[PDB]
């Protein structure tokens, strides 16, 4: 009908203006030149580092990446950090400068961006879901499938709606990160006696649905975000109904949002929601 | 009836905790146990 239109697998190309860099622009590349298997000799990326990252906080790796081991769990200052990439080939280390090389393609920008750790920045996202129900108690049904509903926060930095989540701190696991990020972002201040135990009841059953590479605009050639997605589903809906949603920390507003395929969310969160609906045979 | 099919002992415990406000968990457990012991025989309780 069409005639072999709209490629084969449309790759990811980050936007031209780097976020929060004061107008610093990357080196623009076409989507058929992005992968690392392809040679692409006309490639001159720009090296840019944020002043916040260059000021050396606690969550930032050192500026000289020598002696650091990638693709394995590495101990920095006695705290475990998981530098394992979800890419099957793994992460390759450049011999000239010691910087890691992104296996998921070119992003038109070298150096360490807004991300504090060289290589894989492991992020954890928390998708707290419940079935979308009418006042009568009947489950809403669209396209012959049951309809989901998830907690979404409006980000402070770019005012786009997104799934709550954040970078894994040093010496902590994905469990703590997921719970801590949900209480900090979606809930703000944190939980009333049994209501808190009820939330614990909500938090006792989580399934890792995906561990994928993020289409995050802050990604560079030497620092990229890879996410582990944890779904907390409330089958009965009792625990979900006791949550008092109120935006805190780096989130402006938080709300319950119906899950569908036309959602315009930050980074690759639509893929994460697709994985959640694929696992629970829900509408998407 | 269908509207009582979503009733659970956890929500009952939550209702007792929000209403009476016990000092200790054992007191809440004892009140819940006594409440369940009252309505064991369906003939002896009539709810209007």
């Amino acid at each position: 009908v069409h005639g072999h239109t709209a490629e084969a697998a449309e790759w990811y190309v980050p936007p031209e203006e780097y976020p929060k860099s004061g107008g610093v622009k990357r080196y623009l590349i076409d989507a058929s030149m992005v992968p690392l298997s392809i040679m692409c000799p006309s490639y001159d990326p720009v090296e840019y580092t944020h002043p916040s990252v260059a000021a050396q906080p606690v969550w930032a790796d050192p500026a000289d990446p020598r002696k650091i081991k990638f693709n394995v769990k590495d101990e920095v200052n006695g705290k475990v950090v998981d530098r394992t990439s979800c890419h099957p080939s793994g992460i390759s280390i450049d011999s000239n400068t010691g910087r890691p090389i992104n296996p998921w393609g070119r992003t038109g920008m070298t150096g360490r961006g807004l991300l504090g750790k060289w290589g894989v920045n492991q992020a954890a996202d928390t998708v707290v879901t419940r079935w979308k129900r009418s006042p009568d108690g009947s489950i809403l049904e669209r396209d012959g499938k049951k309809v989901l509903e998830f907690v979404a926060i409006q980000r402070q930095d770019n005012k786009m709606w997104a799934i709550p989540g954040g970078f894994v701190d040093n010496g902590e696991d994905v469990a703590l990160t997921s719970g801590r990020e949900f209480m900090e972002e979606a809930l703000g201040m944190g939980m009333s006696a049994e209501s808190k135990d009820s939330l614990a009841a909500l938090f006792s059953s989580g399934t890792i649905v995906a561990r994928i590479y993020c289409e995050d605009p802050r990604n560079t050639d030497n620092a990229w975000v890879e996410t582990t997605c944890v779904n907390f589903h409330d089958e009965s809906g009792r625990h979900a109904a006791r949550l008092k949603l109120q935006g805190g920390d780096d989130a402006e507003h938080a709300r319950w949002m119906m899950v569908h395929g036309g959602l315009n969310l930050f980074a690759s969160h639509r893929t994460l929601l697709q994985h959640v609906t694929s696992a629970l045979n829900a509408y998407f | 009836l269908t509207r009582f099919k979503s009733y659970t002992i956890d929500d009952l415990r939550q209702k007792v905790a929000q209403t009476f406000n016990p000092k200790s968990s054992q007191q809440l457990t004892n009140l819940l146990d006594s409440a369940l012991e009252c309505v064991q025989d369906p003939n002896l309780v009539v709810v209007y």
């Binding site: 469990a175 719970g179 907390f232 | -």
Partner: peptide, 19 residues
């Protein structure tokens, strides 16, 4: 409504309570 309720109920484990 009883049938509506009946037909409704007819259609990597991780514990994050430590947070």
């Amino acid at each position: 409504i009883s049938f509506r309720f009946s037909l409704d109920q007819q259609a990597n484990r991780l514990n994050s309570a430590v947070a």
